[PDB]
Design a protein around this ligand. Sequence first.
Ligand SMILES: CC(=O)/C(C)=C(/[O-])SCCNC(=O)CCNC(=O)[C@H](O)C(C)(C)COP(=O)(O)OP(=O)(O)OC[C@H]1O[C@@H](n2cnc3c(N)ncnc32)[C@H](O)[C@@H]1OP(=O)(O)O
Ligand SMILES: CC(=O)/C(C)=C(/[O-])SCCNC(=O)CCNC(=O)[C@H](O)C(C)(C)COP(=O)(O)OP(=O)(O)OC[C@H]1O[C@@H](n2cnc3c(N)ncnc32)[C@H](O)[C@@H]1OP(=O)(O)O
Lengths: 355, 355
Amino acid sequence: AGPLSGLRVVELAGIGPGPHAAMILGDLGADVVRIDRPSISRDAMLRNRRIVTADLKSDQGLELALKLIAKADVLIEGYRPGVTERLGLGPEECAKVNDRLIYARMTGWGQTGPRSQQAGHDINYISLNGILHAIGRGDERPVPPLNLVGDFGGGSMFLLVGILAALWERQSSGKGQVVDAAMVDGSSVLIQMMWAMRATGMWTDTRGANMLDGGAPYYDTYECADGRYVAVGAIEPQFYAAMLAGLGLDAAELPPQNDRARWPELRALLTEAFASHDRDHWGAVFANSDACVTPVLAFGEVHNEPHIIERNTFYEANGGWQPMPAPRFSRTASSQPRPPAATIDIEAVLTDWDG
Amino acid sequence: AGPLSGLRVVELAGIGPGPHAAMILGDLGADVVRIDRPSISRDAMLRNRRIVTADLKSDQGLELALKLIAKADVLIEGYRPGVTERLGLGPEECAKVNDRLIYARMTGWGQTGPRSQQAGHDINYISLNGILHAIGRGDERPVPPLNLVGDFGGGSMFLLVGILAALWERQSSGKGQVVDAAMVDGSSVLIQMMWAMRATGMWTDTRGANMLDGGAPYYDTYECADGRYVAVGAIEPQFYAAMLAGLGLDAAELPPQNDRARWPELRALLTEAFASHDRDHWGAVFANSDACVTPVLAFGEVHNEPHIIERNTFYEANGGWQPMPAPRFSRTASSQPRPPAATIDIEAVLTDWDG
Ligand SMILES: CC(=O)/C(C)=C(/[O-])SCCNC(=O)CCNC(=O)[C@H](O)C(C)(C)COP(=O)(O)OP(=O)(O)OC[C@H]1O[C@@H](n2cnc3c(N)ncnc32)[C@H](O)[C@@H]1OP(=O)(O)O
Ligand SMILES: CC(=O)/C(C)=C(/[O-])SCCNC(=O)CCNC(=O)[C@H](O)C(C)(C)COP(=O)(O)OP(=O)(O)OC[C@H]1O[C@@H](n2cnc3c(N)ncnc32)[C@H](O)[C@@H]1OP(=O)(O)O
């Protein structure tokens, strides 16, 4: 029902970014068929799928895969470079049966280069390009921002942009091509703002000492009386003033907002203020204000938040809450995701796809 | 020269996700025209644009904006809901002159709901949906993962997916629609893996006590003899074994990899090992293997890393390095980004676009 209704996607089962990209395509209405190896999933990622099984190293498995690919718009693979090539499913082999195919290759290091054959995970890819070094408090070793930056923000999301951009190009050229989405590249573009700021003296390599990394007292979390937290993001002077107004602090008795030499003094004063009441008290104080103060909610509490409820950001499906499709479309709205279903026959899909 | 060559984009100047989305469209070949308020640029994010100025609150400014929009494929705006409406540039007004327009609305809270009129920044949007609570060490307050997750991973990247998906739909329907990209939604889909794992007992709400948040000794950073860091991401047993081999540790003398009760003991043993030599020594020892051990590089040293150099992940511009376009395309490759140029006349663009 979403904007991608009619789009045919073959997904070769991997981990991390590949399945996340395939999920989003499915969320938006695409017809996604996932090929897994021999031997109902409880993994909520893998919603909006039809799952088939094939031994891609056997003659029969390779034949059935190529027949499926011959009728597809997009192929997603997330193995080491050379893996699909040795299987007989490389770009050159797929082009022989389908030159309209968008061949989307999801890796961390890319298709070539000295590390291209090296195993890795999110934390490794963001280590090499300056990102991981920049995350965390200054007095401690870097902390991983989960796998949000390599696998997803700079990974699957760039694969998706590539797939959809190539599909636009195809409307005029009539032909597909290969998309090389490397997490080391995508995450670098994701953090382009910092590279831009570094060039103009607006960002430093010192961890925890910048405007957006926790270094600024007006852009950080604060612990409240109940041991829970608020987030403060009051960058602009008018928003910062509203924050001080709600705390009841006289600006004339405080250091200037952007006098960095007195930031520890400013932070201590704000720390004392926020610590004087519980988290939910500050929700009441800052209601309908531009102070940029919000409660820091744990996953388990999210479903009780009015703004979350009223916009249906989540749906409840056997097990727990799951995020609804994003972004949203006014005319061709995405459906509530279909849960994981039982594995079906590969020939049944071919009959449906006319292959 | 990239896959989006020929696509016409009008960007109403904002901050954060909007300009980043417009940048990526420009990177991939789109014709992006940014309208700023009247009042050269040092900001590398404004690469691949033509800059014009108009007072959108004046009769003439509004008229010229609508003329430009009448000839565009995409409009990007990142103001509070209602702002474009008040200007006379709302979706209903734009539809009168161009029903093929993809109207892309970039916000934090979304178009409706109790928080939709409140000012905010990245930290606020990720505070409300469980993300911020999950980032950082367990014995301290949450730390912002810069503005990577709300503004970009869960913001601009979802705006881009929406824009390009809506363009795909337009080929068959003949018309555009409104894309509502809210950072609170996009970032929730970005972290879908955690929502999935929470439902199956594979993730907990306790900060710093899980597999991918720094809780696991095989998925974290370690400080070396020189005070610099390595990242370890050796999740799978064969990769973990390769890491132990490189360290010269006897597996029989260590606790099991996934015995969580003995994780502090395991971490202490690995800490002692990594502390015995400098970062670059471990960089050498693990340069080629599948151990998932990488040096943690600061921004300033990224340009000296062989894998970064040989793949041209970055280019030099205005005294500093900037990331090359991502992802990469085999047939319609993106060009090196054009630097920010001087503001040009709005009528010169209309002559070019025939409007
Ligand atoms: C998730 C998470 O926690 C995090 C935090 C992440 O970052 S996730 C991001 C992680 N990084 C990435 O994703 C980056 C890119 N990926 C990689 O670097 C690797 O895939 C990793 C390292 C992930 C696994 O290494 P690996 O050595 O285990 O796998 P491989 O070298 O790719 O070879 C696969 C083999 O399986 C075979 N096969 C497959 N399907 C079928 C089938 N249906 N039928 C039959 N056979 C099949 C292939 O033919 C192939 O066989 P060979 O060619 O060896 O004879
Ligand atoms: C950046 C960063 O470091 C981080 C970490 C981030 O997260 S970034 C993410 C930040 N979050 C978001 O982006 C989320 C969405 N955005 C927002 O919530 C707000 O835009 C913020 C809060 C960012 C600024 O609040 P605000 O009160 O300053 O702005 P506003 O309420 O939107 O109204 C704009 C006004 O400007 C006028 N104008 C514009 N162009 C022209 C023109 N050419 N000619 C003439 N006039 C023009 C409009 O007509 C309008 O006037 P009114 O209608 O009031 O009379």
